[PDB]
Every structure is written in structure tokens, then in C-alpha cells.
Design a protein around this ligand. Sequence first.
Ligand SMILES: C[C@@H]1C[C@H]2O[C@@H]2/C=C\C=C\C(=O)Cc2c(Cl)c(O)cc(O)c2C(=O)O1
Length: 133
Amino acid sequence: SVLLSRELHPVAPLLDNLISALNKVYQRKGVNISMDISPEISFVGEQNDFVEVMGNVLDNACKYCLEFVEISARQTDDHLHIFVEDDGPGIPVGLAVAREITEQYAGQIIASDSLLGGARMEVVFGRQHPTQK
Ligand SMILES: C[C@@H]1C[C@H]2O[C@@H]2/C=C\C=C\C(=O)Cc2c(Cl)c(O)cc(O)c2C(=O)O1
């Protein structure tokens, strides 16, 4: 009976002012943060959930890293993929919040090994079709 558009916010922008903030919180440590995300990649749903999840994950990344954090993302159709990898010792609680919010989006958080040297956290958000009802 009645289709609708869902709110789509670009991700690149949403993480930029979040990176800046972390930079300040950990300049003492010396953390270098890079992101490589195209301007077309976006998120569907409550922009605040995104930033709260990605704040939790990005914060945790900066803590366990040595000095490097790499951010990148890929988009499928009903799924949004965010990759956060660090060079700190790795992964062979905390993200509970990020886990709770990604749950509502039919997604999950996955840990694995990274090339840099540490954890390669992948955040997957679901329910990303851009239409509703
Ligand atoms: C507790 C939360 C996520 C937990 O479910 C995930 C599984 C394994 C975690 C293994 C670790 O060794 C700690 C860790 C490292 Cl080293 C890191 O670089 C980034 C992280 O985010 C975590 C972590 O522990 O994060």
C-alpha cells in the first residue's frame, strides 16, 4: 500500500569528526588514524546508533593499538560493512554496547586477525534496504 525512503546518512562524514575527537583523546599515546571510505557509502537508520557503535569500536581500537588504526568499509545491499584494524597486539565486554546496538540492526560484530598485527574488527549492520513499509 505505501512505500517509503529510509534516512540515509553518509558514513565518511560521520567518522571524520569522530576520528578528530579520538585523535585528541590519545595524542599522548601517539595514535595514527586513517580511513579510506568513498563518499557514496552510507548508513540507514538512526544516525546516533551508528556513531555510538562506531565510537565504541573506534575507542577500543585506539586503546589496544600500538600506534596504528585503519578504517575502511564495504556496502552490499541489506548490509553495511565497517572494518577497523589495528597494529596492537591481537585477538587469538567493552564492545557490549556496540554489540547491543548492532543487534537491533540484524547484524553482528566479528573479531579476527589483521595484517597490521592486531585485531581486525568487522562491524556488520543489517536492515539496510533503502525502502520500507
Ligand atoms: C572485549 C571486546 C570484544 C570481544 O568479543 C571480542 C573478542 C576478542 C577480544 C580479544 C582481545 O585480545 C582484546 C581486544 C584487542 Cl587486543 C583489540 O585490539 C581490540 C578489541 O576490541 C579487543 C576486545 O577484547 O574487544
